[PDB]
Design a protein around this ligand. Structure first.
Ligand SMILES: [Ca+2]
Ligand SMILES: [Ca+2]
Length: 275
């Protein structure tokens, strides 16, 4: 029994699936706590680990990386769920440990491994409250090298009239993603600010969990992978397009929801975006 998560339908991915665009050959690096490659519903092409104590990227001792990955590429078969890009080449770049945290050096190292290894799209469902020249260095270089870089905007909510979008999501070169529910309302925890680009489903997102399980989670970490997936579908239909063009498309065919400070350019529509 294969269940199609609401979010995958909400961003109109199945329309592209029916046409034959499912992300084939598009490499997507999931920079997270690793991905359980043994999960029947995910096919992991490769990766690397930068957590000195957890050298196996195919071992997810946290569960977060696996869930994010499921939303990106859960296989289209007879079981579990269905990712936004079920045919994408899933790369596990493990930079976060068992408890969920990592050092910036580990994270940066992973971003750099992805650039070095020709990733097409990088997904970062993580953010820090403070930045660094080396972090900005890493993301700016990825984009300059053709990579589409996507990141969760953060779960800080609202604070006066100030931005709560964390890094690397804050940098202009990075696609900052907010979380909306099934009724398109902004999640109360979703970070706000002028750096917000788009919104995607982020509440009660059903996905893959370590040890052949499935569970729902809420957070902008669940939102970012939908847009990361969206990029893969667009790239599968238009392999010749640059990351700039892909981004433009995602941002210019959205469904406006409210003020950009809280919803960015709005909810993404991959059917419109893929042209
Ligand atoms: Ca499945
Ligand atoms: Ca940004």
């Amino acid at each position: 029994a294969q269940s199609v998560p609401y979010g995958v339908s909400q961003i109109k991915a199945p329309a592209l699936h029916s046409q034959g665009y499912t992300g084939s050959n598009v490499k997507v690096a999931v920079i997270d706590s690793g991905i359980d490659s043994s999960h029947p519903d995910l096919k992991v092409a490769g990766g690397a680990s930068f957590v000195p104590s957890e050298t196996n990227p195919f071992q997810d001792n946290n569960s977060h990386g696996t869930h994010v990955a499921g939303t990106v590429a859960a296989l289209d078969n007879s079981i579990g769920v269905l990712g936004v890009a079920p045919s994408a080449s899933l790369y596990a770049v493990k930079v976060l440990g068992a408890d969920g945290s990592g050092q910036y050096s580990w994270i940066i190292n992973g971003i750099e491994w992805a650039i070095a290894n020709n990733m097409d799209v990088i997904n970062m469902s993580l953010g820090g409250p403070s930045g660094s020249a080396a972090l900005k260095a890493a993301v700016d270089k990825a984009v300059a090298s053709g990579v589409v870089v996507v990141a969760a905007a953060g779960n800080e909510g609202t604070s006066g009239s100030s931005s709560t979008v964390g890094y690397p999501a804050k940098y202009p070169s990075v696609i900052a993603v907010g979380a909306v529910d099934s009724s398109n309302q902004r999640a109360s925890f979703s970070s706000v600010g002028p750096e917000l680009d788009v919104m995607a489903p982020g509440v009660s997102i059903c996905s893959t969990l370590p040890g052949n399980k499935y569970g729902a989670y809420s957070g902008t970490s669940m939102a970012s992978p939908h847009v990361a997936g969206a990029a893969a579908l667009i790239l599968s239909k238009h392999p010749n397009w640059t990351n700039t063009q892909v981004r433009s498309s995602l941002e210019n065919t959205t469904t406006y929801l409210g003020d950009s400070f809280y919803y960015g350019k709005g909810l993404i529509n991959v059917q419109a975006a893929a042209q």
